[PDB]
């Protein structure tokens, strides 16, 4: 469907394009930098114009930092290798008590993010604790055997 082609799709259907969205950040970084590297005069511009050169580095550094921040969160939650991962944290009806079929078949991800936008930090804290406990349990199983 293309980048954000699934934005108006319902969540269920939209999940089949997670790869499209996931790659867009670093792919875009290397292609944009390539267009810049392919123009020797533009490279001269990066040094000739101090402010422009700084603005470009700032933008690139920030883009990398955001990529990594999200990757670390997946890492600490035990989802580093997955686009889709299930965890051991139960869903709270206080975050949302909406019917599961509406959530996946009628709603889009944009609507959904709004639906639960004030619980993000709660869920993330819970995911962190759950994974921490799980890893300790795994070590105990290995010491036991």
């Amino acid at each position: 469907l293309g980048f954000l082609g699934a934005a108006g799709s319902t969540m269920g259907a939209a999940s089949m394009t997670l790869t499209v969205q996931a790659r867009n950040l670093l792919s875009g970084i290397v292609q944009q930098q390539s267009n810049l590297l392919r123009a020797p005069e533009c490279q001269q511009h990066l040094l000739k114009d101090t402010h422009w050169g700084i603005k470009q580095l700032q933008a690139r550094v920030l883009a990398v930092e955001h990529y990594l921040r999200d990757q670390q969160l997946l890492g600490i939650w035990g989802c580093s290798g997955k686009l889709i991962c299930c965890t051991n944290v139960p869903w709270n009806s206080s975050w949302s008590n909406r019917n599961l079929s509406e959530i996946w078949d009628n709603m889009t991800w944009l609507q959904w993010d709004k639906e639960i936008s004030n619980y993000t930090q709660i869920i993330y804290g819970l995911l962190e604790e759950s994974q921490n406990q799980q890893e300790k349990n795994e070590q105990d199983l290995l010491e036991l055997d």
């Binding site: 980048f3 996931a22 944009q32 690139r60 869903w91 959530i103 993000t120």
Partner: protein, 445 residues
Amino acid sequence: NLWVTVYYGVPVWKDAETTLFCASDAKKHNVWATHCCVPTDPNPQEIHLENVTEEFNMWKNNMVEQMHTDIISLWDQSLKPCVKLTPLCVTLQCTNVTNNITDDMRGELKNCSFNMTTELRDKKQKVYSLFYRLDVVQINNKEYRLINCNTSAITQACPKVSFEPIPIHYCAPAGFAILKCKDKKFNGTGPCTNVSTVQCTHGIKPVVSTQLLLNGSLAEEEVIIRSENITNNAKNILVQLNESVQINCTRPNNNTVKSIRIGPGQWFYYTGDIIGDIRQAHCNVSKATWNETLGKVVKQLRKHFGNNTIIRFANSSGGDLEVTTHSFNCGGEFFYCNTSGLFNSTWISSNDSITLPCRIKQIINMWQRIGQAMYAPPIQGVIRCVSNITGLILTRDGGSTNSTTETFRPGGGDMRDNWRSELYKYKVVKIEPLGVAPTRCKRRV
């Protein structure tokens, strides 16, 4: 029995402010050919977003602020390596240019002479040159000085550098996307249902003007009047026309340009003399096109101010030329046109072109800043340019007593309005790929 499931690569976003890339269409010495050095895509292919509604607000659009900052920065950089003209802050001995001069030009142009520096510190040279009166003021065969000498340094713009605007495309950095509104009736704010995502905007020429909006895009179907608040007389109204009005501008005097060294490689340009007679600079529009254009604007103003009320047009209320006249760059020359010839009508329930006399200035205080002033070198020969009026900046006087008659004037002058009128359809958002949702799935324990 719902559990948290985490998804990465979720197609959602948030409003955001970032730095956009400036990219040209791949004009050897044009300042815009350079700088916006990263080339655009041959096909900046657009992706339509089916069933996506998003809210746009042109008066909160930070793309405008970025362009404004970049326009200023680029100009300051382009003048950085050019010859300073501080040696010109000398007393001048001036008289009236005397030739076959029309009435409207009497005293308009002055004939000045002065002792200028040369490449050696021990030598001076006599320079004879012509200046427009707007650049020269009295000190007290009379004593004059350049107008800027009591405020700031004057520098010469390099004659080899073109500032002719070419289309500029702004492109999002990776991690960001630009949402484009295709609603033909979009008035600058609120939800838009026909939205596509692009990596780059279309090209916008960075055209600068103060009253009439020149060389922009046209509206489809009808004239669109966009303002932050209709009833607020403190706000500007940006009118986007659905048809263009052609303007033919001239600087009818055939100028001879002289060039001297005033230092070590420091070349200075000035008007030496004028060939032929002396005539006033001016711009023409047909009366019919102009009158039809206003009639269309009025039909649309009436939807906001009443279709049984009276709309009249009047000229500028006051201020300096940078405020009261229509200013534009014509081939490197700077024109200040008297638009009272256009905004003179009352609307109620064989071209005879309107001729606007224009003044010319060489010392330009760009962006209305107090600081370094620019000297526009003279142009050899006769200048002609033709521009398209694609819009107007109007202000309502307000002060209304509900008399049923409202007055609009060619106000504005805020340079950001010139770009807001083109960038109104774009929004920048940050991509937020990480999120969660419930499901009947638990991690295997």
